[PDB]
Write a protein that binds this ligand. Structure first.
Ligand SMILES: [Hg+2]
Ligand SMILES: [Hg+2]
Ligand SMILES: [Hg+2]
Ligand SMILES: [Hg+2]
Length: 263
């Protein structure tokens, strides 16, 4: 917890919003991360002084191993560059993992398809899908105890339109008058402790649903949304962090498209 060094950067105007087109803070005072809200130089300093290590987990089975090359190569160019990164690739085809060149301070572990390991190797965990590619900066501005990401297909929708599980018989049930945002099941993270807490809750909830003979409409995503409704995330990432340009184009509200679906 050392002091930051002298830094020179423009002063922020208290009587001027940084973004006048979007909500940059939630009702529970968690920032909503949009381009323009953060000074990456200040944040990089803070996390480097803590010698932060970020774990990135991807789950790639069968035909999905084909997406690993692009995923890892683009992560090397845009994900936590400058910081310690540990990639965890869970796959059923260990020998199929591409030999990707990694920058210094970055490593990759192949796990064929433990929890204690995460607590000892990384400070934060980021969980995403492999059939994606990084197109712009995704850095320490996302790090926090627990974060969710706004689904690109519902950020401007009314909660009634959110595709939450609507059947009371499911543990993921959320009535029409409840809900803050519709988060992505495929891009969340936080401290190892909070991430495992969320995954453990989701695992237990899905089992209860299975015993009751019911499956949530959007499976894991439905449960993650129930969890984040009851345990507010300490940071919320804007749709800049998970977008589909083919289906949604490039709206003016999006200054950057950082992580996207592959056509
Ligand atoms: Hg994970
Ligand atoms: Hg859950
Ligand atoms: Hg689960
Ligand atoms: Hg979950």
């Amino acid at each position: 917890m050392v002091s930051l060094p002298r830094m020179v950067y423009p002063q922020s105007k208290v009587l001027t919003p940084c973004r006048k087109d979007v909500l940059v803070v939630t009702p529970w005072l968690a920032p909503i991360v949009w381009e323009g809200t953060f000074n990456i130089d200040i944040l990089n300093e803070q996390f480097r002084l803590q010698n932060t290590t970020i774990g990135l987990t991807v789950f790639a089975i069968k035909k999905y191993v084909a997406f690993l090359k692009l995923f890892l190569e683009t992560a090397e160019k845009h994900f936590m560059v400058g910081h310690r990164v540990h990639y965890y690739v869970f796959t059923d085809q260990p020998a199929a993992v591409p030999r990707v060149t990694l920058g210094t301070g970055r490593q990759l572990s192949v796990l064929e398809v433990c929890e204690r390991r995460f607590l000892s190797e990384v400070d934060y965990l980021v969980c995403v899908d492999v059939d994606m590619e990084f197109r712009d900066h995704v850095g320490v501005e996302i790090l926090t105890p627990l974060f969710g990401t706004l689904h690109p297909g519902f950020y401007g929708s009314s909660r009634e339109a959110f595709t939450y599980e609507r059947r009371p018989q499911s543990q993921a049930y959320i009535p029409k008058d409840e809900g803050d945002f519709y988060y992505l099941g495929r891009f969340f993270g936080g401290s190892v402790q909070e991430v495992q807490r969320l995954t453990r809750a989701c695992h237990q909830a899905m089992m209860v649903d299975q015993a009751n003979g019911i499956e949530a409409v959007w499976h894991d995503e439905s449960h993650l949304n129930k969890y984040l409704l009851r345990h507010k995330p300490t940071k919320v990432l804007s749709p800049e962090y998970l977008w589909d340009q083919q289906l949604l184009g490039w709206p003016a509200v999006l200054r950057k498209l950082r992580f996207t679906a592959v056509p």
